[PDB]
Subunit: 360 residues, 4 copies
C-alpha cells in the first residue's frame, strides 16, 4: 500500500508528514493502526539531528518516528489473548540474541546496538503510520476499557517501573526499611517537574515514600494542583533545598544538579539516574564527593528502558490511578495534535507535560 506516515531521515534529522510505499508481508501475525502516539525528548532529538545512534531500517532512506504508542488491532492470527478491535501497547525495544535478550530482558541487553532494536529509533519503523504489522508477543493488551487515551502513557511509565525494580534489587544490600518494616517517612526526591518526574512521583507514593519534585524555578498552578492531589510536595531548590534524602531520582541529566543532591543522600541511600542531557555542562567531582558516597554505602544506578512485564505493570497502575484521581491523570496529556502539526517536534505547546498525536 501507499499510506500516510510521519518520518525522519535518521540520524540526519528533519520531519515530514507525507505518504510512503509500505508493502504487506505475506507472513504476519497482526495488523494494527495507531490511535495515539506520545512524543518525548527522544523524538525531538531525533528530528533535530542530535542523536548519532539512530538509524533507518536496512535498505531504506527514512524512519517512521514514534515509539510511545496506543494502537488497535485491525487483524490478527489465531491466539488466546488478542482479537480484532482490542487496543494494545506495542513493545519499543525488541530483543537480539544476548543472554538477557533471549529471556525477554532486552532492556538489560548485554551488547547494546545491534543486538537490540527500538521502534522509531534504531533500525525499525515506528508507529506514526496508518498501518503497522507485528508479532503478538510484542503487544501488551489494554484490559481496562475505561482508560482510553490514558493508556498512551504506558510507554513512559514502564521505564519508571523498571527503575523501581532496580531500586528493589539494589536496596537489598542492607535494611532500607524502618525498624517497623515500612517505608513510612522515607524521603524520595525527584529532580525535575516533567512527564517522567510525575510518573516517578506517583509510583513513589504508592510505595509509601514522602515525595518531593524539585526544579530550579516555580511551577504552574496547574502542575501544583496535580501534585497536591497525589500528596506530592514541590520545592524550588534555589529557594528551599531538601536534605536527608533516602531515594534520589534524576530526570534532568544535569551533573551539577545530580551531585548537589547526592551530597544530601542518607546512609544506604539510592540514586537512580534516568535523565539524558548530552549537552549538560561538566561539574567537578572531587575526592570528598567520592568519600561521601563510599562512607555512606550509597548506590548510584543508571536505568534505561523496561521489559514487557513492566508495560503490564504500568497499565495496572494507570488504571488504579485513573479510578482514584481521574482529573489529575487526564491533565497529564496537555495537548493533542493532528499528524500535520509537525512543529510539535521543534516547539513545545504551552505549559507542556505530555503532548500526543491523535491519529485518524
Amino acid at each position: 500500500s501507499t499510506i500516510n506516515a510521519i518520518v525522519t531521515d535518521a540520524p540526519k534529522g528533519g520531519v515530514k508528514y507525507t505518504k510512503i510505499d509500505m508493502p504487506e508481508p505475506e507472513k504476519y501475525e497482526a495488523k494494527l493502526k495507531p490511535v495515539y502516539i506520545g512524543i518525548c525528548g527522544t523524538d525531538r532529538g531525533e528530528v533535530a539531528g542530535a542523536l548519532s545512534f539512530t538509524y533507518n531500517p536496512e535498505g531504506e532512506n527514512f524512519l517512521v518516528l514514534g515509539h510511545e504508542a496506543l494502537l488497535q488491532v485491525l487483524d490478527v492470527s489465531d491466539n488466546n489473548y488478542i482479537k480484532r478491535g482490542d487496543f494494545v501497547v506495542p513493545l519499543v525495544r525488541r530483543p537480539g540474541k544476548c543472554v538477557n535478550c533471549r529471556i525477554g530482558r532486552q532492556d538489560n541487553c548485554s551488547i547494546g546496538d545491534p543486538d537490540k532494536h527500538e521502534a522509531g529509533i534504531t533500525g525499525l519503523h515506528g508507529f506514526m503510520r496508518d498501518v503497522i504489522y507485528d508479532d503478538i508477543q510484542n503487544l501488551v493488551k489494554v484490559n481496562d476499557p475505561d482508560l482510553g487515551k490514558i493508556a498512551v502513557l504506558t510507554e513512559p511509565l514502564k521505564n519508571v517501573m523498571k527503575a523501581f525494580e532496580v531500586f528493589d534489587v539494589v536496596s537489598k544490600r542492607s535494611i532500607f526499611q524502618n525498624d517497623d518494616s515500612t517505608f513510612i517517612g522515607k524521603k524520595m526526591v525527584v529532580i525535575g517537574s516533567g512527564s517522567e518526574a510525575f510518573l516517578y512521583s506517583f509510583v513513589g507514593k504508592d510505595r509509601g515514600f514522602d515525595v518531593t519534585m524539585v526544579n530550579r524555578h516555580d511551577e504552574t498552578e496547574n502542575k501544583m494542583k496535580m501534585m497536591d492531589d497525589f500528596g506530592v510536595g514541590f520545592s524550588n531548590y534555589l529557594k528551599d533545598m531538601p536534605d536527608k534524602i533516602d531515594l534520589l531520582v534524576d530526570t534532568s541529566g544535569d551533573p551539577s544538579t545530580i551531585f548537589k543532591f547526592v551530597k544530601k543522600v542518607n546512609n544506604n541511600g539510592v540514586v537512580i539516574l534516568f535523565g539524558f542531557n548530552g549537552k549538560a555542562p561538566g561539574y567537578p567531582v572531587n575526592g570528598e564527593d567520592i568519600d561521601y558516597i563510599v562512607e555512606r554505602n550509597i548506590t548510584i544506578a543508571g536505568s534505561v528502558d523496561a521489559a514487557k512485564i513492566h508495560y503490564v505493570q504500568a497499565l495496572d497502575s494507570l488504571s488504579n490511578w485513573y479510578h482514584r484521581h481521574p482529573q489529575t491523570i487526564k491533565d497529564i496529556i496537555t495537548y493533542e495534535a493532528k499528524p500535520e502539526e509537525t512543529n510539535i517536534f521543534f516547539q513545545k505547546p504551552k505549559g507542556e507535560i505530555k503532548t500526543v498525536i491523535k491519529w485518524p
Copy 2:
C-alpha cells in the same frame, strides 16, 4: 594501670609511643594482648590531622591507634568458642541501635556517627596497646594454626569480602554471567597496586574473573611476580588502557582515574567505589558521562567496612591461599616494624605492600 600504647589526639594529629593509664577491670569477658597490628592510609591520615571525622573517646584527650589486628587471648570467661592462648581478630566497627546495627550489620549503619563506633578511629581506642579488654562476640577466632602473622590481613581483606557481597547483590539486576552460567572471561580491573588492590584481585580470581591491577607508573618486580603467581595481570594505564570492563573496583579515591575507567565499563557492568582521598582534585563530570552510565544500566556502589561474617570469610580465604601459594602471601607483609619506629606513620618502607607492627 599503666601500659605502653601508640596514641594520637584525634582529629588534630600526632603520634607517640608512650606510657598511658587505662582502667583494668576485674570483671571482663576477655583480656588480650596484641601480636601484630597492621597499618593503612587511614592510620597515616589520622596522624597528619587530615581526617576531621575522627575523635577521641568521651572525656579523653588521646586515642590509641590501630584497627588491623591480630591478638592473643590472655584470659576469658568460660565459653564454647575461645580459650586462653587462642589467636583472634577483633571487630573494628561496633554496633549502635539502628535497624542495621542491631542485626550485626553495623557496616551498613543507617545513622553513621554517633550510632556506630570504630576502634582506633571514632571515639573508641584501638589495638596498639599492651592490654585490651573486649566481649567475646567482638572477636573472630583464628581456626588455622599454620597462618601465623598472615592472619593479620583479616581486617583489610574483610572489606573486600563485603564489597563483593555488594557486587553480588547489585548484579542481580540482570544476567551478569555468560550464557553458560559462569564468569569465565569476565573482566575485572582494579585501580591501584597497593594492599587492598592485591586482595581484591585475589578474591576476583577466586570468583572466576580475569583480573588486571592498573596504576599510573610501572611496578616493582616484587609485585609483578606476586601478581604472576596468582594469575593476575598488570598494566600501567598511561601505556595500555584496559578496555571493556565488567567489574571495576577503585582503591585510588581519585575522580579522574575513576571516571576515565567508568567510560570503559560494559553494559550491566559494576563499579565499586572503595578508596577515599578527600584531597583528590575535582574532575568535571558532564552530561555525556551520565548518559554513558544510564544507557548501559551500570551500577556504581560505594562500600565501607564489613560484618563479622566477612571476617570469618576472610580468614578462610587467607588460609585457602596460604596452603596454595605460601610465599607470595608472606610477601604481602613487607616490614615488621617495632612500636617505637613511629616514623612509619610518616614514611613508607621501600616497596611497601603491608607494613605491620610486631608487638612486644
Copy 3:
C-alpha cells in the same frame, strides 16, 4: 472501669459477651474502640478449645477475642500520623527480642512463642472489647474514606500479601517467568473457596496468573459470580482435576488434597502452605512423591502472619479493588452480626464468606 467485651478462657474456650475489669494502664499512646471485627476458623477453633497453643495473658482468668479489626481512635498523643477520629487496623502480632522481631518482622519470629504474641490468641487481649489501649507503632491508618467497613478485610489480606512475598523470594531460584518476562498463562490453583482463597485469587489475578479456586463440591452462584467478576475460574475437582500448575496455594490444611495437587505441579513450581487443620487425617507420602518434588525442583513453603508493611499493602489493594469493582468487594462481607449474637462462633450464615461483627 467496667466495659462490655467478648472473651473466652483459652485453651479450654467457650464464649460469653460479658463485662470485665479493664483498668487504664500507665503508659499508653492511644485509646480506641472497635468499629468492626472480622472472624475466621482460628476464632472458632479457640472457642471449641481446639488449639493447644492459645492461652490467657499472664495472670488473668480470661482472653478477649478478635484479631481482624477496624478500630477508631478516641484519644492520642501529639504525633504526625494519627488523630482523634482516624480509623486504624491494629497489628495482630507484636514483637519480642529476636533478630527478626527487632526489625519488625515478628511474622518471621526465630523463637516462636513466647518471644512474639498475637492479640486474641497468645497471651494478649483481642479487640472485641469496648475500650483498647495501644501504642501508635502498632496501628495502621486507613487513608481511604470510601472504604468504610471494607477495611476490616485488611487482616486476612495481609497474610496473603506476606505469602506472595514468600513466593517472590523463593521463586528466584530459577526463572519462573515466560521468555517474554511476563507471567502470562502461568497457572495458579488455590485449594478452597473461602475468604482467604478469594483474597489469594484476586492477588494472583493482579500478579498476572490464570487463577482457578477449587473444591470437593460446586459453589453458590453468589460465589461463582464474584469469581467471574474478577476473572477467576472455579472447578470442583471430582468433576474436573486441574493440571500443570505453577503456583499451588492451600487454604484447606488437608494433606490428602495438598499432595494430590502437588503431583500436578510443574518444574520450578511453588507450593504455598497456608491453611491449617489440626484434625485432618494423614495421607501417605511415598518415595515417588518425594522424587516428584526433587526432580522438578519444586519448593513447598509454609507461611504465617505478616508484617506491618503488608497491612499497608493490603489497604492499598482494597482501595484499588473497591474503586474498580465496588459492587464485588462489598459482597465479600456476607453478614454484619451483633456481639450479642454469638451463634456465629458455632454456625455459618448461609453461604458466608466473611462474617463481620458491628460494635455497639
Copy 4:
C-alpha cells in the same frame, strides 16, 4: 571404530562391559578418553531396571553408562582454555531450548524431558567408553594438578553446590543468621552417611554450621574418623535423634525419616530434599504435620542437578579440601575397580563411600 564401553539397555536394566562402534562424527571440537568414572545409586538403579525415566539415545539399542567423570583431552580445536593433555570434568546435563536451558541453567529446565538430556541417563551416551567427543563449552577444566583422581568427585559435589545456592535463595525469606551476622552454632543435620552426605557436611562446615550426619545404624570406623577430621558429628538416630535443626538435608529418599526430622526443624528452617527412592514406602502426614510447617515459616525445597558454575565451585572446594586434609579426602575414594568388575553395579563393596572405575 570399535571401542570398549560399559552399557545397559535403558530402562530395562542389565549391564555389560563390551565392544561397540563409535564412528568419528564429522564435526567435533574435542576428543577425550576417561581416566576415572565414579558410580552412584543412579547407576545401580539403572542397571537394576528400577528407573522409569531413563532411555537409550535415538535409534540405538543400548546406553553407555557413567555420568561422574574425569577425562583427559586427546585432541581439541584451538582455543584459549584447554589444550591436549588437560584434564576436564564434563557436564552431565545438556541444555534444551526453554528459558532456563538457554542461559545455562538447564539444571532448572522448565520442561523436564525431552528438553534437557543427561549423559548416561536420558537419551545421551555416558562416559564409560574409550573415546568421547564433545564441545569445549561442556568441559570444565581441572586447574589444580595435585588433585589427580580426587577430581572425579566433582560431579557429585556440584549437586551439593547447587543445593546450597537453593538454600541461599530461600533463606532470604527472613533473617536466618545470628544477630552477629554469622552462622555460628546454627545446626545442619544430614540424613544419610554416604558420599553425598559427606560432601553436604563438608560444605556445611565451610559455611560455618555445626553439622551432624545421621543414620539408622552405627557407622564404620573409617567413616567416623573422616567425620572427625572435618569436625563433623554423627548419630545413630535409633538411639539419639538431633533436635533444633536449622538446615536439614536428606540423601535417603525415605518419607518416614524425612517427615520425622521435619518435626525437629526450627522456625525459618530449611529442608533440602535431595535423595530419591521410588520404592520407599508411604508415611502418613497429617494435619498437624502440615501445621508444624506453616507455623514455623519452614521451606522444603527439592533440588536436582547443577549448573556449570557449580562444577567450577566444586573443583575449587575439592582443592581447598585437599591441600588441608590430604588423607581424609583421598579416603573418600574407597574402591578402584576395573571396567570388567561389573559386579560393583550390584554389590556395594564393604566400607563404600565412593567406588570408582579406573579406565584402562
